[PDB]
Amino acid sequence: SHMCDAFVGTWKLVSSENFDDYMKEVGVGFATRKVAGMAKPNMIISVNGDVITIKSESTFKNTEISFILGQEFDEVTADDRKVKSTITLDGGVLVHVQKWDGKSTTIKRKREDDKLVVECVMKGVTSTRVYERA
Numbered sequence: 001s002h003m004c005d006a007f008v009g010t011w012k013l014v015s016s017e018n019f020d021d022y023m024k025e026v027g028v029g030f031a032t033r034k035v036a037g038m039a040k041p042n043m044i045i046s047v048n049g050d051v052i053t054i055k056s057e058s059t060f061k062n063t064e065i066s067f068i069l070g071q072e073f074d075e076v077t078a079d080d081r082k083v084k085s086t087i088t089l090d091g092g093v094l095v096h097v098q099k100w101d102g103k104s105t106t107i108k109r110k111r112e113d114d115k116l117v118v119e120c121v122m123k124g125v126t127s128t129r130v131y132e133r134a
């Protein structure tokens with residue numbers, strides 16, 4: 001058993017704010033922003049030993065990352081950036097940093113009440129996305 005337990009399960013998007021703006025900041029093109037912004041993903045978090053898996057399933061894309069906390073990995077994002085990612089647990093929050101082309105973005109995932117809150121930041125543009133158990 002582990003503190004990451006609080007994240008495990010199947011989650012459904014219930015609200016999004018400022019995500020088109022965040023995606024613009026990151027450099028996502030118009031057509032991708034439109035189609036990804038329409039997506040209503042289900043997000044499946046699981047843990048097997050030290051390996052955490054986060055899967056997103058939507059009509060836009062079905063993606064998945066697996067990782068060990070603190071240990072860099074290379075990720076291809078749904079908008080086709082090739083980034084170096086590191087995810088750590090800080091004070092109960094999963095902190096995901098992606099670095100590419102001298103740029104960086106941080107994605108925080110946290111449990112608040114019965115929700116899983118996703119906060120995405122690029123420069124000083126923040127987007128908040130709220131998920132509930134499916």
Ligand SMILES: CCSC1=NC(=O)CC(=O)N1C1CCCCC1
Nearest residue numbers: 041054055056063064065118129
């Ligand atoms: C735009 C949909 S993708 C997505 N959306 C979210 O709001 C949270 C989340 O973590 N993901 C992905 C990221 C890549 C790994 C699998 C999950």
Ligand SMILES: CCSC1=NC(=O)CC(=O)N1C1CCCCC1
Nearest residue numbers: 023028036077078079107118120
């Ligand atoms: C909520 C995290 S956003 C995110 N995280 C990733 O780890 C991969 C990825 O592809 N994305 C975005 C990128 C913009 C297009 C929509 C998905």
